[PDB]
């Protein structure tokens, strides 16, 4: 009866406390990602170990600008990820495209291509409003897998 | 009032609402309203994250989500108050361990046939099935033909729809087969007689609605959905092995979501082709689609390359 | 001028060549650094312990937007249509129309927060000195239906802290 | 209760191989100048209970293109010959007493690489296909460097069993006398088990990810728990075959105490390297074995053969 | 050298799509905005096309 | 004055996510038909 809703203080605390983010370097924004894993603001060892292969991940991250020829590549990679997946865009160019938003060869927005969750806003987000964009996503698991099996 | 061209980021003046619209069918309709422009208010029951795979469907500020239960007479009254057309796909397979299933085709489709009628919707719509007949069959197939009777009372204008057995991409109809790696294929019931029904391809049904969605001039007047040619054989169950070359679940697993040794086995062989006099399709057309050509796509198995069919 | 690097010759005498054969075969190098220069772990780590501690900045920083107002408020913006016309990205959108008394003000003012490239071109063209890039990285909401701003989102977002802003410009305005 | 002496072994070790993964990035943390997993612990010591549980919840895909019959019997190994090899290993009292058992390791050191060749082939094409082929090729050429330099010392101790090998290292820490060899006993186990400076098997640089690439969270805990069940064993061996402790027929307990404060120092060596050195570019990788490591290992064998005979030294065994 | 004289009225096809025949361009001399007297905005014959609907979003 | 008392946050749905709107007066002012008489 009540055991389920106490069980989700385990499984919904496990998936939020270990993340294996992929990253996409593409454009300027990649360097202000690196400095999140450099020792100043130290990304790993605060619970999130940095890049792994495409298969083993949970949260992919889009930096950079997405042209036409990169779209056929992304949408494929987003699939293969396992279940408990999310997409956290960052930078002013995954939100509606920085500038270049009027260009010919830039997709406009990268929400169009995938179901994106959290956003961050500015050429490079300051390597700070990154982590405070994740401490949104570790607080964006308040969800319960109870009340699907156990209501309907 | 419709503006511009129908590409995306356009208007085309219709709002909507689509109840259900998570599982196989509803996801595949809204995707045709996230194109020609709309305001598609899709509510949903329990699922916070299972609805995301939908969101890159309408452009921006088109589709919008709410939360509802459906036995509360308010939850259906808070949304619809602003709407033009509202269709209804709601309902499912097996009796739930919670919902007793009896009136969920009776009370629910009426519970949303509450103030919707009152509040001034229009072109309200509902679903039927080609095989549901109020004579005695079939325990699930019954209670569905009650809605055609019981619910039609309300909202004299419906254009309630009557399609066949459908085969989609992720659909469970033709996919119950080929999942049958098992002690062996045993037809229902070990007879090659009355297979098969009218297997229309899921595009044409979901292109029917939006063709009646502003039709005009179909309201109250119900239609039924032609299959392709023509009836079909036993070979359909052989055809599966001819080419195949032989939401909100859980964290670990689901206790019971079975093959249902119940109506399920007998719902598939009930056949009963029925009245032609319904208009019912080319009039709402123009669509009809075959089987032989469109059944490779949805069927891909452990060869993944050879076909030569 | 010049320099020449990696131009040298081995000495070739038996006082040396032991020193290079006491190296290959005994590993006397290659334990020099990474037997050591690695450890050398005994230094204090450098980490800004994030949810609490935070790092440095400067009064000229750029970030979330605002619209000030004087003492008793005038909505300092006069709608002179400039911060709109120097904008590289073309985020800004402005529609004036004469307010009731006859002093002009705005109606729609919308900074898109995806397109804005964070120049510092809209802080520096406003002659009446209204629009100002705030120093707060509060951001990151979950729906792109949102970040587009209207007017009456901005003012609050710029009256939520004016104790932050009104004390930066009076450090910085003496330089420019 | 002999069955409860076993199951008291398999279980209490799966905690080390678990909590190594934590001390993985603390020690390798302060080489970088930072702290290690911290926020969750409080000290971090609570991290690995959360990590063991994310995988088996996370959905285990199989490639549509695979042969499922091999995609099981292979990993159903990477966890046997890792947990069987532990059996006859004195600390001080081994669970089994095998007469000639030292030889029995090479039996189980040789039979694991025939679980690599399955998996990488079991699945599919060229990242795990020819990519699991040529990590076979290096793994078998670092045995001949091995069995010899294991066989050398055994001239210097008399037999194949391990109860003698505590007796002979009494007051002589067997690393004096053959210190030339001991080096090569180290670079081997580090080259054979696919660790830092010769890293190629598991990919990072030379390829994407070697041999792990296909397994999703489901099976890939086993390998990631198998590959660390070899590394803490060869290194829990070296120190019974070189740095000996002093048995005590009275306080057996003080044997192991001083024994894990050695084997646990020693191990923290494959972590103390990995921060440091780069990779070899597979040519140079074998090309440095025949030419370079090997000629000595033969030559020394012609030496430890004669040294007993030429001193009337011949060790007291059969 | 292959000089090969001939005459075929130069045209080019396929690069745009349906906007070849649908529209009508226009060639006109700009008229001088009259709020000011500066005569230098003249002097080049530009061209600009027909205008089609802009709607509201 | 003209500044707040306590505070707010950046929240994901609070319920209030603010979800912006349009700030302007109408446009073309459609015609009204005449009333009841012929
Ligand atoms: C995938 C799921 C399906 C597979 C499930 C089953 C898998 C089994 C795999 C077997 C792998 C381990 C087999 C290795 C055999 C090693 C035996 C050995 O070396 O024992 C040493 C010992 C020597 O005797 P000694 O010490 O000299 O004299 C003692 C005097 N008191 O010897 C002795 O003490 C006497 C020997 C007693 C043991 C009886 C013989 C056991 C070996 C049978 C193995 C059968 C092969 C199974 C398949 C192997 C495939 C790798
Ligand atoms: N016309 C045909 O050919 C045909 C064929 C088979 C079945 N049907 C029936 O016609 C409709 C087609 O449904 P479908 O193809 O989309 O498959 P479906 O899986 O039944 O889709 C129904 C969606 O609504 C949900 N749902 C179930 N019961 C609900 C309830 N009381 N209230 C609100 N939501 C409920 C379901 O789970 P959630 O509650 O989590 O959303 C699901 O998300 C259904 O009623 C079906 O039983 C028709
Ligand atoms: S906006 Fe972000 S992404 Fe686009 S260029 Fe500047 S940094 Fe690179
Ligand atoms: S701030 Fe300066 S620029 Fe922006 S509107 Fe008011 S006046 Fe025109
Ligand atoms: S901030 Fe940078 S981009 Fe946004 S408007 Fe002012 S200048 Fe143009």
UniProtKB/Swiss-Prot annotation, chain B:
Subcellular location as annotated: Mitochondrion matrix
InterPro entries for this protein: ComplexI_NDUFA9_subunit, Epimerase_deHydtase, NAD(P)-bd_dom_sf
Cofactor descriptive note: Binds 1 FAD per subunit.
* Record note on modification: Acetylated on lysine residues. BLOC1S1 is required for acetylation.
Listed GO biological process terms: circadian rhythm; ubiquinone biosynthetic process
One short Pfam name that applies is: Epimerase
One Gene Ontology cellular component annotation held by this UniProt entry: mitochondrial inner membrane
As stated in the Swiss-Prot or TrEMBL entry, residues carrying the post-translational modification N6-succinyllysine are: 135
| Keywords attached to this entry | Acetylation, Electron transport, FAD, Flavoprotein, Mitochondrion, Respiratory chain, Transit peptide, Transport
Which domain of life, per UniProt?
Answer: Eukaryota
Modified residue annotations for N6-acetyllysine: 149
Which cofactor names does the annotation list? FAD
Q: Which GO terms describe its molecular function?
A: NADH dehydrogenase activity; protein-containing complex binding
- Chain's role: Accessory subunit of the mitochondrial membrane respiratory chain NADH dehydrogenase (Complex I), that is believed not to be involved in catalysis. Complex I functions in the transfer of electrons from NADH to the respiratory chain. The immediate electron acceptor for the enzyme is believed to be ubiquinone.
State the family it belongs to. Belongs to the complex I NDUFA9 subunit family.
Q: How does it assemble?
A: Complex I is composed of 45 different subunits. This a component of the hydrophobic protein fraction. Interacts with BLOC1S1. Interacts with SLC2A4. Interacts with CLOCK. Interacts with RAB5IF.
Name of the protein this chain belongs to: NADH dehydrogenase [ubiquinone] 1 alpha subcomplex subunit 9, mitochondrial
Q: Which organism is it from?
A: Bos taurus (Bovine)
Swiss-Prot record, chain C:
Major place of localization? mitochondrion
The free-text cofactor remark is: Binds 2 [4Fe-4S] clusters per subunit.
Compartments in which it is found: Mitochondrion inner membrane
Domain 4Fe-4S ferredoxin-type, residue spans: 68-97, 107-136
List GO terms (cellular component aspect): mitochondrial inner membrane; respiratory chain complex I
What cofactor requirement does the entry state? [4Fe-4S] cluster
Q: What is this protein called?
A: NADH dehydrogenase [ubiquinone] iron-sulfur protein 8, mitochondrial
Q: Which organism is it from?
A: Bos taurus (Bovine)
Q: What is the lineage of its organism?
A: Eukaryota, Metazoa, Chordata, Craniata, Vertebrata
- Whole-protein coverage range: 37 to 212 of 212
Curated annotation (Swiss-Prot), chain D:
Residues where N-formylmethionine is found? 1
Q: Name one GO biological process term.
A: aerobic respiration
Q: Could you state one GO cellular component term attached to this entry?
A: respiratory chain complex I
* Residues annotated as transmembrane: 2-22, 70-90, 100-120, 146-166, 172-192, 222-242, 253-273, 294-314
Which EC class heads this enzyme's classification? Answer: translocase
What Gene Ontology molecular function terms does this protein carry?
A: NADH dehydrogenase (ubiquinone) activity
Pfam families assigned to the protein according to its UniProt record, in alphabetical order: NADHdh
Q: Which UniProt keywords apply?
A: Electron transport, Formylation, Membrane, Mitochondrion, Mitochondrion inner membrane, NAD, Respiratory chain, Translocase, Transmembrane, Transmembrane helix, Transport, Ubiquinone
The chemistry this enzyme catalyses reads: a ubiquinone + NADH + 5 H(+)(in) = a ubiquinol + NAD(+) + 4 H(+)(out)
User: Which Enzyme Commission number(s) are listed?
Assistant: 7.1.1.2
Topology versus the membrane? Multi-pass membrane protein
Sequence similarity: Belongs to the complex I subunit 1 family.
Summarize the subunit comment: Core subunit of respiratory chain NADH dehydrogenase (Complex I) which is composed of 45 different subunits.
Q: What is the stated purpose of this protein?
A: Core subunit of the mitochondrial membrane respiratory chain NADH dehydrogenase (Complex I) which catalyzes electron transfer from NADH through the respiratory chain, using ubiquinone as an electron acceptor. Essential for the catalytic activity of complex I. Essential for the assembly of complex I.
Indicate what this protein is called per its UniProt record. Answer: NADH-ubiquinone oxidoreductase chain 1
Q: Name the gene for this chain.
A: MT-ND1
UniProtKB/Swiss-Prot annotation, chain E:
Q: Which cysteines are joined by disulfide bonds?
A: none
Question: So which residues are the signal peptide here?
Answer: none
Compartment(s) = Mitochondrion inner membrane
| Post-translational modification as stated in the protein's UniProt record | Phosphorylated.
Give the family, as the similarity comment puts it.
Belongs to the complex I NDUFS4 subunit family.
Summarize the subunit comment. Answer: Mammalian complex I is composed of 45 different subunits. This is a component of the iron-sulfur (IP) fragment of the enzyme. Interacts with BCAP31 and TOMM40; the interaction mediates its translocation to the mitochondria; the interaction with BCAP31 is direct.
Protein purpose: Accessory subunit of the mitochondrial membrane respiratory chain NADH dehydrogenase (Complex I), that is believed not to be involved in catalysis. Complex I functions in the transfer of electrons from NADH to the respiratory chain. The immediate electron acceptor for the enzyme is believed to be ubiquinone.
Task: Name it.
Answer: NADH dehydrogenase [ubiquinone] iron-sulfur protein 4, mitochondrial
What is the native source organism of this protein?
Bos taurus (Bovine)
């Amino acid at each position: 009866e009540y055991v389920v809703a106490k069980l989700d203080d385990l499984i919904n605390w496990a998936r939020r406390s270990s993340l294996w983010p992929m990253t996409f370097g593409l454009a300027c924004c990649a360097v202000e990602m690196m400095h999140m894993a450099a020792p100043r603001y130290d990304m790993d060892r605060f619970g999130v170990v940095f890049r792994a292969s495409p298969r083993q991940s949970d949260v992919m991250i889009v930096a950079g600008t997405l042209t036409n020829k990169m779209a056929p590549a992304l949408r494929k990679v987003y699939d293969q990820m396992p279940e408990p997946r999310y997409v956290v865009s960052m930078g002013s160019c995954a939100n509606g495209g920085g500038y270049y938003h009027y260009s010919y060869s830039v997709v406009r927005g990268c929400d169009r291509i995938v179901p994106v969750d959290i956003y961050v806003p500015g050429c490079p987000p300051t390597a700070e409003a990154l982590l405070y964009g994740i401490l949104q996503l570790q607080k964006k698991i308040k969800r319960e897998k109870r009340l699907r099996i156990w209501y309907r | 009032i419709p503006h511009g061209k129908g590409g995306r980021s356009s208007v085309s003046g219709i709002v909507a609402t689509v109840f259900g619209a998570t599982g196989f069918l509803g996801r595949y309709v809204v995707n045709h309203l996230g194109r020609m422009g709309s305001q598609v208010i899709v509510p949903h029951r329990c699922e916070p994250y299972d609805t995301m795979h939908l969101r890159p469907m309408g452009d921006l500020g088109q589709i919008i989500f709410m939360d509802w239960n459906g036995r509360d007479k308010d939850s259906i009254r808070r949304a619809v108050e602003h709407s033009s057309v509202v269709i209804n796909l709601v309902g499912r397979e097996w009796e739930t361990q919670n919902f007793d299933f009896e009136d969920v085709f009776v009370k629910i489709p009426q519970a949303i046939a509450q103030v919707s009628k009152e509040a001034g919707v229009e072109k309200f719509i509902h679903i039927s099935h080609l095989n549901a007949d109020i004579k005695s069959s079939s325990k699930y197939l019954r209670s569905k033909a009650v809605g055609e009777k019981e619910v039609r009372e309300t909202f004299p204008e419906a254009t309630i729809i009557k399609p066949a057995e459908i085969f989609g991409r992720e659909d469970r109809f033709l996919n119950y087969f080929a999942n049958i790696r098992w002690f062996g294929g045993v037809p229902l019931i070990s007879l090659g007689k009355k297979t098969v029904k009218q297997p229309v391809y899921i595009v044409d049904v979901t292109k029917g609605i939006i063709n009646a969605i502003k039709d005009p001039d179909a309201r109250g007047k119900t239609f039924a959905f032609v299959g392709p040619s023509r009836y079909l054989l036993f070979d359909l169950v052989q055809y599966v092995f001819a080419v195949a070359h032989r939401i909100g679940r859980l964290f670990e697993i689901s206790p019971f979501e079975p093959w249902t040794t119940r109506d399920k086995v007998e719902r598939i062989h009930t056949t009963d082709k029925i009245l032609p006099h319904l208009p019912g399709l080319e009039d709402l057309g123009v669509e009809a689609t075959p089987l032989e050509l469109k059944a490779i796509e949805v069927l891909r198995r452990h060869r993944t390359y050879r076909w030569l069919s | 001028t010049y320099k020449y690097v990696n131009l040298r010759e081995p000495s070739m005498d038996m006082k040396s060549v032991t020193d290079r054969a006491a190296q290959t075969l005994l590993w006397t190098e290659l334990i020099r650094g990474l037997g050591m220069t690695l450890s050398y772990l005994f230094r204090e780590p450098a980490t800004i312990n994030y949810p609490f501690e935070k790092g440095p900045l400067s009064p000229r920083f750029r970030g979330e937007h605002a619209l000030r107002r004087y003492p008793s408020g005038e909505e300092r913006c006069i709608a002179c249509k400039l911060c709109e016309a120097v904008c590289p990205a073309q985020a800004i959108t402005i529609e004036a129309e004469p307010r009731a008394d006859g002093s002009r003000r705005t109606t729609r003012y919308d900074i898109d927060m995806t397109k804005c490239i964070y120049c510092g071109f809209c802080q520096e063209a406003c002659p009446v000195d209204a629009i100002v890039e705030g120093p707060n990285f509060e951001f990151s909401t979950e729906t792109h239906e949102e970040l587009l701003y209207n007017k009456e989102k901005l003012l609050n977002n710029g009256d939520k802290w004016e104790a932050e802003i009104a004390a930066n410009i009076q450090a910085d305005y003496l330089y420019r | 209760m002999f069955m409860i002496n076993i199951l008291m072994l398999i279980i209490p070790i799966l905690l080390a191989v678990a909590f190594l993964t934590l001390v993985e990035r603390k020690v390798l943390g302060y080489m970088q100048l930072r702290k290690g997993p911290n926020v969750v612990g409080p000290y971090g010591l609570l991290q690995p209970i959360a990590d063991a549980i994310k995988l088996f919840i996370k959905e285990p895909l199989r490639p549509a293109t695979s042969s499922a019959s091999m995609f099981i019997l292979a990993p159903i190994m990477a966890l046997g010959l890792a947990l069987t090899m532990w059996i006859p290993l004195p600390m001080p009292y081994p669970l089994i007493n095998m007469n000639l058992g030292v030889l029995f390791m090479l039996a189980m050191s040789s039979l694991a690489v025939y679980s690599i060749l399955w998996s990488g082939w079991a699945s599919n094409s060229k990242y795990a296909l020819i990519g699991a082929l040529r990590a076979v090729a290096q793994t078998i050429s670092y045995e001949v460097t091995l069995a010899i330099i294991l066989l050398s010392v055994l001239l210097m101790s008399g037999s194949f069993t391990l109860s003698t090998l505590i007796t002979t290292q009494e007051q002589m820490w067997l690393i004096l006398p053959a210190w030339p060899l001991a080096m090569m006993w180290f670079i081997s186990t580090l080259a054979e088990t696919n660790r830092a400076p010769f890293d190629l098997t598991e990919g990072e640089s030379e390829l994407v990810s070697g041999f792990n690439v296909e397994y999703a969270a489901g099976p890939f805990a086993l390998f990631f728990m198998a590959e660390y069940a070899n590394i803490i064993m060869m290194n829990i061996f070296t120190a019974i075959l070189f740095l000996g402790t002093s048995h005590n027929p009275h306080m057996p307990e003080l044997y192991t105490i001083n024994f894990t404060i050695k084997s646990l120092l020693l191990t923290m060596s494959f972590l103390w390297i990995r921060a440091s050195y780069p990779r070899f570019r597979y040519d140079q990788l074998m090309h440095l074995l025949w030419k370079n490591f090997l000629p000595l290992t033969l030559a020394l064998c012609m030496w430890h053969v004669s040294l007993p005979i030429l001193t009337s030294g011949i060790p007291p065994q059969t | 050298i292959t000089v090969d004289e001939k005459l075929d009225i130069t045209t080019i096809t396929g690069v745009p799509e349906e906007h070849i025949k649908t529209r009508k361009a226009r060639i006109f001399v700009p008229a001088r905005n009259n709020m000011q007297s500066g005569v230098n905005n003249t002097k080049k014959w530009k061209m600009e096309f027909d205008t089609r609907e802009r709607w509201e979003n | 004055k003209f500044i707040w008392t306590n505070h707010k946050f950046n929240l994901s749905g609070t319920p209030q996510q603010y979800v912006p709107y349009s700030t302007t007066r109408k446009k073309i002012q459609e015609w009204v038909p005449p009333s009841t008489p012929y």
